[PDB]
Structures are given as C-alpha cells and as structure tokens.
mmCIF file of C-alpha atoms in Angstrom:
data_model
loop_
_atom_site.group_PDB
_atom_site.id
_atom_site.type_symbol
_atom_site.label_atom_id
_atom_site.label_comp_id
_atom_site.label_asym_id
_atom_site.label_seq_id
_atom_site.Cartn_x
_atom_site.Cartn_y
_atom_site.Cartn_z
ATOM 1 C CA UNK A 1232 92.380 98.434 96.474
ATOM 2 C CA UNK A 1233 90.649 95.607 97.957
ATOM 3 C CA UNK A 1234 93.765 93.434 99.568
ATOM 4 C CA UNK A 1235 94.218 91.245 102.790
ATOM 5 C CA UNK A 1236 97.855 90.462 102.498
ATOM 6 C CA UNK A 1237 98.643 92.126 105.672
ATOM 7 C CA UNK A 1238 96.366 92.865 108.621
ATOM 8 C CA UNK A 1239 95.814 96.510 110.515
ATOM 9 C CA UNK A 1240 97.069 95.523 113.518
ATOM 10 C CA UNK A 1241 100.339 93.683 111.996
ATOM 11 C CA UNK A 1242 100.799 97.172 110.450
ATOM 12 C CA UNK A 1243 101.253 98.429 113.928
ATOM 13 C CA UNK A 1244 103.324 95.770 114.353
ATOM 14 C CA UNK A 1245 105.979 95.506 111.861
ATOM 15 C CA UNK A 1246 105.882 99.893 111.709
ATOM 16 C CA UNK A 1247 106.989 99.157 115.709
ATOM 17 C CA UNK A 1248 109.796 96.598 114.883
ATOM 18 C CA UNK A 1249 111.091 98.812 112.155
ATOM 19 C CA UNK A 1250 110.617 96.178 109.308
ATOM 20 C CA UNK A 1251 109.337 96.172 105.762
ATOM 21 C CA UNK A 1252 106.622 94.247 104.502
ATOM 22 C CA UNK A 1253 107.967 93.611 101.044
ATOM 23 C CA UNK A 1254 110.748 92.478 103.068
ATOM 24 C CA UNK A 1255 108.679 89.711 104.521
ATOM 25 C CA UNK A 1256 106.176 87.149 103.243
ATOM 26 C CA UNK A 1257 102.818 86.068 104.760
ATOM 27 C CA UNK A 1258 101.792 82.463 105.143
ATOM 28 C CA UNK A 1259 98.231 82.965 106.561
ATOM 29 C CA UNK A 1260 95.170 81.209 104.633
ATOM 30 C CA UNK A 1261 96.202 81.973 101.043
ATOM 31 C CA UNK A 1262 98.773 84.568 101.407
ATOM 32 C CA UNK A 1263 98.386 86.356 104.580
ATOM 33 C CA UNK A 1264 101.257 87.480 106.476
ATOM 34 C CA UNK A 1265 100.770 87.077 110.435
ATOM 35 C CA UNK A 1266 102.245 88.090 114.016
ATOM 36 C CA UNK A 1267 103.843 84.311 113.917
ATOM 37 C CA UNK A 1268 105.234 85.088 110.167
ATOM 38 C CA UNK A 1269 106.701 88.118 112.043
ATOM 39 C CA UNK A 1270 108.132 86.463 114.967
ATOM 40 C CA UNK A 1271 109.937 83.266 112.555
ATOM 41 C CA UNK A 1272 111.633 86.952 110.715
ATOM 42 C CA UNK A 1273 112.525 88.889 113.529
ATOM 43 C CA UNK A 1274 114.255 85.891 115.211
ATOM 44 C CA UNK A 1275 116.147 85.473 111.589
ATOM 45 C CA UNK A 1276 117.055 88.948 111.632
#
C-alpha cells in the first residue's frame, strides 16, 4: 500500500521507454529507483 520504491513521474518514464520495473533496481535514499538508475539501464540495454 504505502511504498516509495518508484516515483510517479519515473512511472511515466520507464512506461515511455518500454521497460519493467522489476526489471530494474532503484538506488535512491534507501531503495528508491531514479531517472539516473534509469539512464545507467537504458545505456546497458
């Protein structure tokens, strides 16, 4: 319910890139994936 693994606007994001969360993993202040976690996997991808 209550989660801040990945942010609204990353959601946007990722859904416009064609990627998969699960298929990525978030770095941000205790487990948060972010637009630079994004860019390091869709350079390695």
């Amino acid at each position: 319910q209550n989660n801040d693994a990945l942010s609204p606007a990353i959601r946007r994001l990722l859904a416009e890139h064609n990627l998969d969360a699960s298929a990525i993993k978030g770095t941000g202040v205790g487990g948060r994936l972010t637009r630079e976690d994004v860019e390091k996997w869709l350079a390695k991808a």
